[PDB]
Design a protein around this ligand. Structure first.
Ligand SMILES: *[C@@H]1O[C@H](CO)[C@@H](O[C@@H]2O[C@H](CO)[C@@H](O[C@@H]3O[C@H](CO[C@H]4O[C@H](CO)[C@@H](O)[C@H](O)[C@@H]4O)[C@@H](O)[C@H](O[C@H]4O[C@H](CO)[C@@H](O)[C@H](O)[C@@H]4O)[C@@H]3O)[C@H](O)[C@H]2NC(C)=O)[C@H](O)[C@H]1NC(C)=O
Ligand SMILES: *[C@@H]1O[C@H](CO)[C@@H](O[C@@H]2O[C@H](CO)[C@@H](O[C@@H]3O[C@H](CO[C@H]4O[C@H](CO)[C@@H](O)[C@H](O)[C@@H]4O)[C@@H](O)[C@H](O[C@H]4O[C@H](CO)[C@@H](O)[C@H](O)[C@@H]4O)[C@@H]3O)[C@H](O)[C@H]2NC(C)=O)[C@H](O)[C@H]1NC(C)=O
Ligand SMILES: *[C@@H]1O[C@H](CO)[C@@H](O)[C@H](O)[C@H]1NC(C)=O
Ligand SMILES: *[C@@H]1O[C@H](CO)[C@@H](O)[C@H](O)[C@H]1NC(C)=O
Ligand SMILES: *[C@@H]1O[C@H](CO)[C@@H](O)[C@H](O)[C@H]1NC(C)=O
Ligand SMILES: *[C@@H]1O[C@H](CO)[C@@H](O)[C@H](O)[C@H]1NC(C)=O
Lengths: 510, 512
């Protein structure tokens, strides 16, 4: 059915633990697991260091006492941050009793304290965080029962049990940007007056210089705003992928900053996955438009009347948010949702997989791979829930078959990396080692980022349609253009990306 | 009248009444006023608390544009005494529900003025406050448990909790006693139910390491069901500094008459001790507590003239709370209290020793019980009952009941099944008797407060029964008849020097 990929290294643990990439460089990666955290070299996926932290027997008997199982009552490490002083911030679920520690140098415990609101209770990939400018921004639950979602920083949280700010969310990522912190998640829909247990995906925002409102507002955000993400197929017959699954770090594709995301359809719907990309400027620009009106007993009204917006627009970052008015802070706490939806790049998904057997689950991008013609293409890697990795680019052929520009998906390879059933949780790219680290629940596998060296046939080199591999005609070797040097006026190298895959093969003589 | 001893008529409408348990001084809180009196209702001090310029749209510090402060009345909502530190607490309706701290010897003196919004700023929205042990420290410091109805007249009203513990420390006066990031000594009603689902707090009391609130409220938060009003009982462990133990069970006072009769609306409550005979019926010791409450059948939220008197022992209240808690922790049903946060299913738990003292955990924390504590009333009435008080100075428990028409009735409770009126007379005709109705320190006089007056009523008077058929005919449990002397009087007043044991005879044990 599917060709297996050439596995370079692997790092295996049990299936019982649950790996979460907590930090990644091109040289090293940190993996939080059941009772330890690993410092792993990307050179050979070899363990370099370890820090074990087990829940006390009394704390994990309390967990099983309150209705949990053995596999739930462990100390799943889920937050890491290197503090600016050389200190190490390390938090774990601690059998549904989350704790945070301060390791100082090897390491020795220097502080231990409760972590409610700073670190999830459950090892599920429900939460996220961002250690931005020496401050931990956390998005998780603060209660054992999981019904109090919040976004917490030092002395600032969202409104407890306020469903207009957060209605049963699942966080997928958090990005630092330009004095804001963006949170990506899927949420329950109460925005529309006729909501019926629908799930929509949001991007949220808080100012980093937020200090709370005046008087009683001093413990709550004065800048929390969210917008819906639009990953739909346009046309007369729209098709929406409303449940966001994974995001990527910000990717610098030329002059545009982009965030790539994986979306899927809801349960009991036509099963399907998609990949979309959103400009960082489009995300921020949505927070400058109208606000969406709150629910009333009439439920027949436009977005917020623009006469109710205060003179200093809510959401902007003021130097002292404690100087705002009760009118202004109460407004933004009752209108946290923007009216406009963040549009997608090219206005459509970059890849779609509808009514297939598998679903997409993770995303990673190798930006700005210069092709043979000198065009820059982002190479997109998306893993499936059955252990495959799809590689592809997008070509924007200008007027190839109609007057409106047509976007096309060029699939480079879709190979099996993990055993046939195992879900791919995350992806980490090392452009240096030309390696792609695939992360499952209990393993890390590395595969080649680009397969130019492996192929030896002319048909294969052109049918691959990788923007970085091209067939030489002086040398019979299919070569990697990152290390090679073409000169634009030589018929030596051969590459075909815009055509079909069979048409690329016809370029091969004999 | 000889049964009524002193009568004090006041110039304003009166709201609350308390008696100092050791000095017997009387404190009366009213509209725009605040009075202090001696145990004989002689006026000592009077304090003018209003009117002042105030708008409901404005706080003390800021007044939004196009809104103007206007002179408004100051309804007294809380009246309390702190015993550890001699100081009186009085809260008014103005300025978003502000409390003042006044000296106990002289109420005219203000010792501490707080700006914190603590109490309902409405004139008719309930507010219940009592002082009892609590956090931050282990139970050596007392706190103020407050329950406030959402007046729905200001944006500043969302800031005020519905049930909360509040500190009595001079440094942190009236702040929430213990508060952290995700939890504290506080319960709010959610943004979606806050303006529609109101809670009426009737009575508050502390008993055996738990704080209690007697409430009337809608049975359901969602609009899926027709509006039914029920009486609930709100509880919190006093060691609990997280309100993990916030729990509610409904309270049913059910009657046989007209097929099914439910007295759903409670009007007043009183916590007191039983008598030798009554304690045997309830299966409790004489030192145990009994809750006395008067319920009225209500057309919607309005009480009708069809009331009943119901008693509840706190052993059966604690065993009913335990019954609802045990059931949730066994995985059955839904957690309840959907008006705090959306109601999630009860979790199955390995808990093996949930008892009457259960003090709460992270799991199944805000629990709403559906199994009610049920009682059959010992008496029913053709008028709306508005107060209740119980004394067992005699060998029997006598319950004092106030009427919305101004009548005082006495009921003697011999069992959980048998009780009947033996006295009934008007104290202030045409004037509803206030809920705050308290006894003297010896339980010899009872203070009955109507709209504008307070009456010191003698609990019993056996001397006015001349002949003996009148003494035993009055069927007064306080009154017997000495054989030798021609006096009607209690047992202690006769002299057992007579050889016959029939020297003092009761109204049902013998014939005169
Ligand atoms: C996972 O495990 C790996 C391997 O154990 C860790 O990688 C090592 O991390 C340590 C700590 O950061 C590194 O030590 C630091 O090296 C810096 C550079 O060293 C090179 O360059 C200098 C000259 O510039 C040469 O002399 C040297 O031989 C190296 O060639 C130093 O600049 C650092 O010193 C500074 O910082 C310390 C700490 O604050 C100060 O006390 C010093 O005074 C000075 O200011 C420091 O010595 C080490 O080099 C890393 N090794 C490798 C192979 O990369 C990972 O850190 C670990 N994972 C995580 C998340 O920590
Ligand atoms: C996710 O992203 C997609 C694509 O970016 C959005 O799809 C767009 O949806 C909007 C509205 O839902 C569409 O705009 C609508 O066009 C209708 C007809 O357009 C034709 O007619 C105009 C006339 O000038 C032509 O110029 C045009 O080329 C088309 O031929 C209008 O009827 C719509 O109503 C509005 O305008 C009319 C006319 O002025 C008014 O009478 C109405 O009251 C109203 O103001 C509107 O203009 C747009 O075409 C869609 N694009 C695509 C590519 O499909 C999704 O809506 C978005 N999803 C979310 C949730 O944000
Ligand atoms: C405010 O109080 C003043 C007394 O100082 C009074 O004259 C005035 O009428 C009040 N304000 C309004 C709007 O009535
Ligand atoms: C009580 O306080 C008032 C106001 O301070 C004062 O006028 C009075 O003299 C004080 N003492 C008595 C006994 O009234
Ligand atoms: C408050 O209650 C009294 C007596 O029931 C009534 O006269 C008055 O109108 C009520 N006020 C409001 C604002 O409902
Ligand atoms: C109920 O009884 C009181 C007597 O105190 C009276 O004021 C009221 O009008 C009565 N209501 C009805 C409906 O009989």
């Amino acid at each position: 059915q599917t060709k297996q990929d050439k596995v370079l290294a692997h790092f295996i643990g049990n299936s019982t633990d649950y790996f979460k990439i907590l930090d990644h460089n091109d040289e090293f990666v940190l993996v939080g697991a059941k009772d330890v955290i690993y410092n792993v070299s990307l050179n050979g996926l070899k363990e370099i260091a370890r820090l074990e932290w087990h829940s006390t027997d009394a704390d994990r008997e309390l967990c099983a006492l309150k209705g949990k199982h053995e596999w739930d009552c462990h100390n799943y490490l889920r937050v890491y941050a290197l503090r600016p002083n050389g200190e190490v911030l390390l938090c774990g679920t601690n059998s549904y009793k989350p704790r945070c520690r301060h390791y100082t140098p090897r390491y020795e415990v220097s502080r231990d304290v409760e972590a409610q609101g700073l670190c999830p209770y459950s090892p599920a990939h429900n939460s996220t965080y961002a250690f931005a400018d020496g401050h931990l921004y956390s998005a998780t639950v603060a209660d054992f029962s999981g019904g109090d979602p919040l976004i917490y920083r030092e002395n600032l949280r969202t409104e407890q049990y306020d469903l207009k700010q957060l209605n049963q969310p699942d966080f997928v990522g958090a990005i630092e940007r330009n004095g804001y912190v963006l949170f990506f998640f899927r949420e329950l829909s109460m925005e529309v007056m006729n909501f019926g247990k629908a799930v929509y995906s949001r991007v949220a925002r808080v100012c980093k210089n937020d200090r709370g409102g005046p008087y009683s507002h001093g413990k709550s955000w004065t800048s929390f705003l969210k917008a819906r993400l639009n990953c739909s197929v346009p046309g007369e017959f729209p098709f929406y992928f409303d449940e966001i699954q994974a995001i990527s770090p910000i990717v610098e594709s030329g002059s545009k900053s982009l965030i790539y995301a994986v979306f899927t359809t809801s349960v009991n719907a036509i099963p399907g996955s998609a990949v979309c990309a959103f400009n960082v400027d489009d995300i921020l620009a949505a927070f400058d438009g109208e606000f969406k009106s709150q629910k009333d007993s009439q439920s027949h009204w436009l977005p917020v009347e623009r006469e109710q917006v205060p003179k200093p627009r809510p959401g902007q970052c003021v130097e002292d948010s404690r100087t705002l008015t009760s009118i202004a802070v109460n407004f933004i706490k009752n209108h946290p949702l923007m009216e406009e939806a963040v549009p997608a790049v090219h206005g459509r998904p970059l890849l779609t997989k509808v009514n297939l057997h598998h679903r997409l689950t993770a995303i990673a991008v190798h930006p700005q791979v210069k092709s043979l013609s000198g065009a820059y293409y982002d190479v997109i890697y998306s893993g499936t829930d059955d252990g495959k990795v799809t590689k592809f680019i997008n070509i924007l052929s200008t007027h190839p078959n109609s007057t409106v520009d047509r976007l096309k998906t060029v699939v480079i390879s879709e190979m099996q990396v993990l055993p046939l059933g195992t879900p791919i949780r995350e992806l980490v790219i090392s452009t240096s080692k030309n390696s792609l680290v695939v992360v499952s629940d209990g393993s890390l596998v590395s595969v080649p980022l680009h397969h130019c060296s492996h192929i030896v046939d002319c048909l294969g080199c052109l049918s691959l349609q990788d923007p970085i591999c091209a067939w030489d005609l002086q040398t019979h070797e299919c070569k990697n253009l990152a290390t090679s040097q073409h000169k634009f006026g030589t018929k030596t190298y051969l590459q075909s990306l815009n055509s079909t895959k069979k048409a690329a093969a016809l370029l091969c003589p004999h | 009248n000889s049964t009524i001893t002193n009568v004090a008529a006041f110039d304003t409408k009166l709201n609350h009444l308390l008696v100092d348990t050791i000095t017997g001084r009387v404190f009366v809180g009213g509209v725009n006023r605040l009075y202090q009196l001696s145990p004989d209702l002689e006026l000592s001090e009077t304090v003018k608390t209003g009117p002042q310029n105030d708008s409901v749209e404005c706080s003390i510090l800021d007044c939004p544009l196009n809104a103007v402060r206007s002179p408004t009345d100051n309804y007294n909502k809380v009246l309390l005494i702190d015993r550890a530190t001699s100081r009186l607490i009085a809260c008014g309706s103005l300025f978003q529900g502000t409390c003042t701290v006044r000296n106990l010897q002289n109420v005219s003196i203000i010792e501490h003025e707080v700006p914190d919004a603590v109490v309902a700023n409405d004139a008719n929205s309930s507010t219940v406050a009592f002082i009892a042990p609590g956090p931050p420290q282990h139970p050596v410091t007392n706190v103020m448990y407050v329950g406030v109805t959402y007046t729905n007249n200001s944006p500043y009203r969302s800031e005020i909790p519905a049930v909360a513990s509040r500190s009595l420390e001079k440094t942190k006066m009236f702040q929430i006693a213990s508060s952290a990031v995700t939890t504290g000594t506080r319960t709010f009603i959610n943004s979606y139910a806050r303006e529609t689902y109101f809670v009426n707090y009737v009575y508050g009391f502390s008993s055996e390491r738990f704080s209690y609130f007697l409430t009337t409220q809608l049975k359901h938060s969602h609009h899926s069901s027709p509006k039914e009003y029920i009486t609930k009982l709100v509880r919190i462990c006093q060691e609990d500094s997280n309100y993990y133990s916030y729990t509610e069970i409904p309270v049913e006072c059910i009657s046989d008459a007209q097929g099914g009769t439910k007295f759903n609306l409670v009007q007043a409550g009183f916590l007191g001790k039983p008598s030798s005979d009554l304690a045997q019926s309830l299966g409790i010791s004489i030192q145990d507590d009994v809750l006395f409450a008067v319920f009225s059948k209500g057309e919607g939220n309005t009480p009708t003239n069809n009331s009943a008197l119901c008693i509840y022992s706190l052993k059966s209240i604690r065993r009913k709370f335990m019954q609802n808690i045990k059931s949730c922790f066994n995985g059955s049903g839904m957690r309840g209290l959907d008006f705090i946060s959306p109601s999630m299913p009860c979790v199955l738990t390995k808990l093996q020793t949930i008892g009457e003292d259960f003090c709460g955990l992270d799991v199944n924390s805000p629990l709403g019980g559906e199994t009610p504590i049920t009682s059959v009333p010992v008496a029913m009435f053709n008028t709306k009952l508005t107060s209740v008080a119980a004394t067992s100075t005699s060998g029997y428990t006598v319950v004092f009941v106030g009427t919305s028409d101004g009548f005082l009735k006495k009921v003697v409770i011999e069992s959980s099944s048998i009780a009947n009126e033996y006295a009934s007379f008007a104290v202030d005709l045409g004037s509803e008797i206030n809920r705050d109705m308290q006894f003297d320190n010896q339980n010899l006089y009872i203070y009955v407060m109507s709209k504008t007056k307070v009456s010191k009523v003698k609990v019993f008077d056996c001397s006015d029964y001349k002949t003996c058929g009148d003494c035993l005919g009055a069927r007064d449990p306080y009154c017997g008849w000495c054989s030798l002397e021609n006096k009607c009087s209690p047992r202690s007043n006769c002299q057992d020097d007579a050889n016959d044991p029939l020297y003092w005879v009761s109204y049902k044990t013998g014939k005169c």
